[model samples]
Target chain A: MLEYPIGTPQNLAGMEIAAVYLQPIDMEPEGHMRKASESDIHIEADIHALSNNPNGYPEGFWVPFLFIKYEITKVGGSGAPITGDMMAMVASDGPHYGDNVKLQGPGKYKVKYTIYPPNAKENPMSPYYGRHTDRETGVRPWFKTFSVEWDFTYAG
Target chain B: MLEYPIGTPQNLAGMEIAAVYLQPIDMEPEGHMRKASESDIHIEADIHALSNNPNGYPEGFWVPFLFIKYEITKVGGSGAPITGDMMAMVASDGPHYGDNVKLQGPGKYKVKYTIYPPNAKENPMSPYYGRHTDRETGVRPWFKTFSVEWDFTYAGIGKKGGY
Candidate 1:
């Protein structure tokens, strides 16, 4: 139930991106998906980060697997845009980068996102990034790939 | 980050199993999972359902991609016994059947689950089911494997990392 927010929240490198709109996500074997009354909103991408840096994570943690993407349009062009890749969920309001759009009814929209890095690629096409590296559970590495955009005005 | 409840929520066929405990799962290319300070409880299994009949779904749901299974034990015996298959997630406290265990500290435990449906097999070995039969988006069939058990108590969680 995120009945709000679509602009305001940005950062880079240290992560923190934003975009919202909720309600509509009827999942669970519903013919594989598409029926939250057939979609109307539910478009998110709220990435945050900063849980103690420099590779030691544990001071107010907040960073969960990345590679979020989204593309929608409609500033004056009305149709066909809604691009792809953004579904790293967790509802009841928490983990982000979700999808479920069937817009074309709302007005003045934009949404962009592109934020990657969970080992951008070189061995991480996203299987939810493995994490165990030995040496007494060692850790470190990840940060590169970016982009964020917004311009809300949906009132359908 | 859950911190309680480990029993009570049963219901068969139509589904509604339960068991919980949270705090572990620090994955993110850290070398392929097992950090959250080496794991110590993040076990969950909370399935629920209410079917919007004739398969239209929206009458309350939370049984995503079934094929859930867990098997732990420690009633009077301790080491070795904490089986697998339970990872149909979604956090911030929603969606269920998780996994992350390394217990050997707290006591009284005996969890078991073997529910399967979401088109239980027939080439459906969990690719997250795909139906598409005939008449308009199609769907109809799934409901057969079952088993659920509990006898729990594990109050332990003092290690944090990510997830």
Candidate 2:
């Protein structure tokens, strides 16, 4: 079992007994599993405006642009698998975009994206000001984030 | 640096590795750090969704809601450090509705959410549904996700015990 202490940095003195009493690090040698490629391939998270104008857009409003960088570990299969790389817009349906992002034989291949309010500038008077806010009034900020998890396998 | 092999189930059979690597196993000796008894805490995360309706709400699409759970590991000098076991939201900014859930503690926490439209009921008027024929007809489903992260001191301070 693994363990990490929980308490103020100053209070750590109080946690020594806890840590000592906890199980000691007891991991067997890697055995054959010593080598490993990135196992999970997930980008779970959320993105939101750091802040915004409560009243809304124009004078003071900014959308939190979220960028997800997913590292494609391995296509995972006995065959070559998709070996290279591909991309898909979380918002785009049916049609996805895939390009050549090299793969170092089954290593980690990373991909990322930036998301912002589409019409951040289209409407001015509208109460909809992307997903940001006005610091003074403490209002009107919008953003998104996530907690995504996935995994795949590959074979030589 | 550490690494893992995404070998085939057959390859892994001879080698040995969990189907999914349960992380921080030997790394985090105890578990993880959580916020203490602080109010107005926050758990930031990133998530995404899919839809069939382009204009408003989805019209026959599957939506996946992803979220993260956190613990109140430690509290700052004041009972209100910028961090705590608070929940950050993605998607719509509705009032703090009961449709939401919360977790609290100082150990391990896990969270997962997903919504599929094609997998959802076909209610044309429902927000989760969408139509393929709809253009900016405002029926195109939009993908929205959120990300969560935190920063705290992992290094311990002071002599052993005697607090």
Candidate 3:
């Protein structure tokens, strides 16, 4: 079985999220290469996910997952996906905006972000199997999901 | 004369501006009263300013000022101004988003922030006169202002109790 942190199943209420633009740097090489109309686009972002634990105790030990989908759209080009990941235990005691997240090349981009709580139907193999279960069984806490999008550009 | 913090004028290269949303709360009263359509709109924001200064010294003491224009637009409602302020030395070490920023009754708000280096045209009374001098003088740092906007909504006062 895959190793993952599990906690006393609690409600995902009041979970906080935020992001910050670090700076423009070199793009990652392993990622798919983009045909440069002029220059390569590189950008870094910090995506922060904070849990609702009062004492900050059950910080990341639970299956409260974090997923990010970065949709990069160029000025004169079509939109494309640069990176997207879903996992749990990524919560931090302090602000943890996704740092140094490299984009493909130097161009204007509109970054869209979709963040939400854990759902078993989305990932059954994980520990958050019944997270979306009805509250009648005292298994889930009602919470709101967030979906925010922003814009970024690299002049380099 | 209005008293304000003064610092050794510095270059504006690498300066950046950003903001963070605190949470949903009641709208502050005493401002221009917005027309009510059976609901109250409330929201808060923290605008942050980061300077290139290595030590982050003289943090807002210098001229670089921060300005914010909070435009509240409700569904099927026309755009209306909630509040907007322009001042200097408002910078802080940590996230400085506007705290308990009052809004019209609960709905989505588009907060637009405008940040720029010192400009004499804007604040002639301030010490930023030299900043607007000549570019060839090499005294001013070449940098661009930022116009970023974000959206937020208040589900009501229930979320305010946790704080």
Candidate 4:
């Protein structure tokens, strides 16, 4: 399970962004308990339009743009694939794409989280589509790219 | 996922040994699927009685006398407790004992399989209770102890090893 704050836009065209991630919970079978089972690992992104849109737009004008990628790798022991790589896109409304976020196997697993903010060149459907040109500065989108890495262990 | 034959007794007084084991399987959710699922790694132990018995015993004179211990530990990496240690007894009828043997997490995990064969001193529910002595040889039960270690990795959700 993992959760982190990717970042918030700090420049003139800045936006509010945060991320949440969680792995499956440990549960034991009860009365009619049976064999083994698998569970999901949840991930979500919160992209909010804050204040003062600069590119000839109204207040807090923003088009959602967030990209996330995850990769799991084993460290020590030997076994099969416990989980796979995960890639997701966070939209304007802030919802977690990619439904493949689930618990992998038990071992020394490495997880990588990468986030790419909104860029007009990447998202051509927005009004400011060609480039992240700021109306005031007449320059490129003023945002930062972020990434993080963490380790995970599963007890089989 | 992993499956291995702990052993098969090849002795004479082995007419009273029982064994049962199971491993986790790989399974994925279909359309409209949900939680609380089950998969099998698929580990089974075939126990049989292959020799003679003296105390009013028949060809298959076996009584529940098998004990198994499973210790699952995390070696490297960092995360929460994936799974816990397991200990169970294999009945004479050979039924899967523990239900908590499900997929826990992916990492450097160690599994230890320990088995204690039929011993009258440990299990006194059989005809050979109280003492592992033979009337003819006046010696201990001529069975050897067995144990093994294994490593496992889980890719994520639906990747199962072909054992």
Candidate 5:
């Protein structure tokens, strides 16, 4: 229900990064005709890469480039974990956010990353705050993270 | 979840009362488990016949007796209509509110009653407040009513109050 917005990168290493959460539509049930229940789902996408910035690397640096996608899944519980069929993909874009982007606008781009949280029971939100301490390790575990070549339209 | 309560009745005619806008249990979704959103429900009860008193009816004449049951279906809307499950058996016991009754032990009991309303959905409560209402039609509509018999036991209790 939320998305983070990122601004155009000035030097690739600038600390001025941002993210955005996308909002979903909400409707009351009383009079609404049930559209799609918790089922009926299909997802697909593609993304291309375009990058030129290279500083801290002897060889050129490789970052996220491509498309992003996510799907709905089962709700999670406290003692019990939640399962999800949702998926998201990240892609790279051109220097501009407009219509001139070539492959992204007309061709079949490439896929770069995917995510399926480890806990199969708890919902990413709600009753379960994002904290998860390892039972044996006595240390909080980091959720698996995925990244791809994402574009900085100004530099791409 | 509200229900009408009546104790002993001296006369043969029963009492008329009801409760509405009560909350109901939420439903669960399939596959992915989810509680249904919150909502409101309505419940109604009543009775007919009462032993006639010289002036009116004997105080608390309709004592212990049998009654009917009620069920909830829907709430809040202008279109269609609202209806509940059909009639069923219910029971009650009492010495009437004004008079006194004896008690010994504590136990659970069932209470039920039937009411005739021209339209359960349209008739609003009197005083536009209180809890129950008068909605029957015709001459008897003024007097026409239902009957109910429930169970009660003697006991040692503390404070008493309910809706």
Candidate 6:
């Protein structure tokens, strides 16, 4: 039951994670992202750094590319859970990890985000975040899988 | 001379490139981007992957992060070259490399963009573009500095009222 698309913002390992819910929009050339007609909510994870970012981040930049697995369940655990991996895209609002998903209308929901390092994918991106294992330029190792949750209410 | 806001698109290193020129617009929290008052034109380099992406691309996604140094000169060698590193930002059009620029005004202009790999900076990013060195998931090394040119005509942001 959310009144606004943006949920409360919280800090995790020096980064901020906010859950967003909004009406879906269209993306170019098709097939790259889910369409608005197929889903009711566009869920976005806005992850960014405030200060003292992990080793590789440019000061005051968004957290490097990431994989976010989201799991949503009815508060009472009475229904089948909803889960999906979020993808990257840019909106006028800025870059974020998001996906369009179908939701059971208007009820309390528990949202779980399983955040993974960039390389968790089959093909890893160079110059990716939380990567680099040299002596001088290397950074503190990737933090353990970041898992957090939120209690949300859906108004509609 | 160009009449529309967008130039033709071409291919470079398997990516598509187009030059965009428009009236300066605003960006949040200020300081991150040049103010509209100080800039006459907002130049954008729209680079994206079409297909057969270099190894790590997630199919149809935008190309990896890049650094673009834009050099603009009057059609002739009449004035100092305008040079600055373009910054990455998103607008209604999506993610691309661009920067706010000052122009002398009205005429055919020669623009040179010297594209650099993401890690070319003092501090490099891991999980950065063309940076993985692993045997299995590694990709083709970053292509040598990519360079491209374009011609544009600006009629002043005021003539048509800037966007």
- What are the lDDT figures for the candidates, one per model? 0.59, 0.22, 0.32, 0.35, 0.22, 0.61
Model 1 stretches with alpha carbons more than 4 Å out: A1-69, A74-130, A135-156, B1-71, B74-163
Question: Across residues A2-93, which tens digit of lDDT does each residue of candidate 6 receive?
Answer: 31544478887767788877765454324545667788777878777656655345444456456788998878856799998776554443
lDDT for position A90 in model 4: 21
True contacts kept of 1: 0.06
Best candidate, DockQ = 1
- Clash count, one per candidate: 9, 109, 19, 26, 81, 12
Query: Residue B110 lDDT in model 5?
Result: 32
If chain B of candidate 6 is superposed on the true chain B, what is its TM-score? 0.80
lDDT of 4 by residue, B1-163 (tens): 2233333333334443323333432111111111114543433333334434432222442222344455655666464433432222221122222322444455455555555553423422221122212132122333545655656544445444222
Docking class of 5: incorrect
| Residue-wise C-alpha lDDT for candidate 1, range A35-114, written one tens digit per residue | 65677876777765544443333332345546576787988784887777655433333235566678788688888877
Report the C-alpha lDDT of model 6 over B53-74, residue by residue, as the tens digit: 5534433445545767888887
Two-way TM-score contest, 4 vs 5, winner: 4
Question: Over the stretch A1-156, how does candidate 4's per-residue lDDT look in tens digits?
Answer: 234332332332344444444442221111111111444443433333455433222233222224445554566546443433222222212223222344455555655554554342332212111121212213223355565555655453
Task: Write candidate 1's Cα lDDT for B1-163 as tens digits.
Answer: 2356777887766556778766665544334434556787667777665554233333335555466677888888747887877554333333355667776666677888787765566223343233332233334455677778889766434433211
Least accurate 10 contiguous residues by lDDT in model 1 chain B: B128-137
Tell me how each candidate scores on DockQ against the true complex: 0.06, 0.02, 0.01, 0.01, 0.01, 0.04
Please give, for residues B42-107, the per-residue lDDT of candidate 5 as tens digits.
Answer: 122333224332212223222111222332211222323222332111111111111011111233
lDDT of 3 at B90: 13
- The window of 10 residues in a row where model 1 chain A has the poorest summed lDDT is A128-137
lDDT of 1 at A151: 86
TM-score of each: 0.29, 0.21, 0.30, 0.27, 0.17, 0.50
Q: Give candidate 2 regions above 4 Å deviation.
A: A1-137, A140-156, B1-102, B116-163
* Candidate that would win on lDDT: 6
